[PDB]
Scaffold this active site. Sequence first.
Site, PDB file in Angstrom:
ATOM      1  CB  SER A  86      -0.995   0.005   1.182  1.00  0.00           C
ATOM      2  OG  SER A  86      -2.006  -0.948   1.003  1.00  0.00           O
ATOM      3  CE  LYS A 123      -4.227   1.074  -0.596  1.00  0.00           C
ATOM      4  NZ  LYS A 123      -4.231   0.203   0.612  1.00  0.00           N
ATOM      5  CB  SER A 154      -4.507   1.565   4.319  1.00  0.00           C
ATOM      6  OG  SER A 154      -3.449   1.102   3.468  1.00  0.00           O
ATOM      7  CD  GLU A 210      -4.455  -2.494  -3.183  1.00  0.00           C
ATOM      8  OE1 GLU A 210      -3.628  -1.511  -2.951  1.00  0.00           O
ATOM      9  OE2 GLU A 210      -4.288  -3.634  -2.769  1.00  0.00           O
ATOM     10  CB  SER A 261       1.324  -5.089   5.664  1.00  0.00           C
ATOM     11  OG  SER A 261      -0.095  -5.071   5.780  1.00  0.00           O
TER      12      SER A 261
END
Length: 263
Positions: free
Chosen positions: A45, A48, A105, A141, A212
Site C-alpha cells: 500500500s 497508494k 489504506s 488491489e 503490508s
Amino acid sequence: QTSAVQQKLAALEKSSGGRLGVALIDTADNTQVLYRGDERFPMCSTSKVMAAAAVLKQSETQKQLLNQPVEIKPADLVNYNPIAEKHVNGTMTLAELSAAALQYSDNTAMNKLIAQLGGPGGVTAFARAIGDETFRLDRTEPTLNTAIPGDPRDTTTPRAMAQTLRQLTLGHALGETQRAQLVTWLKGNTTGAASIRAGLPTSWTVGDKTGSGDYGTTNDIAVIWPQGRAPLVLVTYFTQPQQNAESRRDVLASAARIIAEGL
Ligand SMILES: O=C(Nc1cccc(-c2nn[nH]n2)c1)c1cc(C(F)(F)F)cc2[nH]cnc12
Ligand SMILES: O=C(Nc1cccc(-c2nn[nH]n2)c1)c1cc(C(F)(F)F)cc2[nH]cnc12
C-alpha cells in the site's frame, strides 16, 4: 564502503530473519543513507501515494476533478474497505477516495484511483513523468500485495521511492496546492504510529504511508520534519521468506531509530 549506520541496519536485519531496505534523504544537505537501496521490494500500500499523486497531477488541469461524484457499487468492494463500504450504491469524490486510500489504506478507494488513471500502467506512466524509472504498478488491489520473493510486479527500490517521495512532497513534481494537499493527507494518516514514527523522537512531525502483504511484508514511507532540522524522507521496506510470516512494524521502527541516531 560500509558505514556505522549500515552495519547496524545489517545487524537488525540479521536478527529479524528477513530482508530490509532503507533509504534516507536528508534535505538539509541532500545526503543519502541506503541499505539494500537498489534492491527491489514489493510496495504494497505504499503505492497508494503514487496513485493519489497521479490524480492530484490530473487535477492541476481540471479544477473540479477532485469534486466530481464517483459511483461506488457492491461489486467494487474488495478485502479492506472501511470507508468505501459505507458509500456502496452512492458516490465518493476523487478527493474522498484519495483521503480514504492514504489515511485509512482503503483498497476499494485505491482501485478507483487506479481506474481514473486507466489502470496500473497509468500509475507507472505518472512515475516515469516525474523521473522515477524504477517504480512499477502491474496489478490492482488486492493482488498487488502478493509480495512473492523474486517477483518484479508491483515493486520499487528504496532509493527510487525516497527520491520520488521527496519530489512529490517537498519538491516540484506537483503544483504548490497539490503538494500541500498531499502533505496534509500524509500527516493525517491513521495507520503509522507503530512504524517509522515509533523509532523517532516524539517531537518530530511525520507524514507517512504504510503497507503490508504476504511474506510478512511490512513497509512505511515517510516525510519527516525533525525538531531543529530540515525535513527528511525515509523509506523502510521489509519482507520475509515464509508466505505466512507475521508483520513486523517494530523492525521498521528499529530501522528509523538507527537512522535518527546516525544523523
Ligand atoms: O488491513 C490490514 N491487512 C489486511 C487487510 C485485508 C486482508 C488481509 C489479508 N489477506 N490475506 N491475509 N491477510 C490483510 C492491515 C495490516 C497491518 C499490518 F499490521 F501491518 F499487518 C496494518 C494495517 N493498518 C491498516 N490495515 C492494516
Ligand atoms: O490487501 C492486503 N493487505 C492490506 C490491505 C489493506 C491495507 C493494508 C495495509 N495498509 N497499511 N499496512 N497494511 C494491507 C493483502 C492482500 C493479499 C493478497 F493475497 F495479495 F490479496 C495478501 C495479504 N497478506 C497480508 N495482507 C494481504
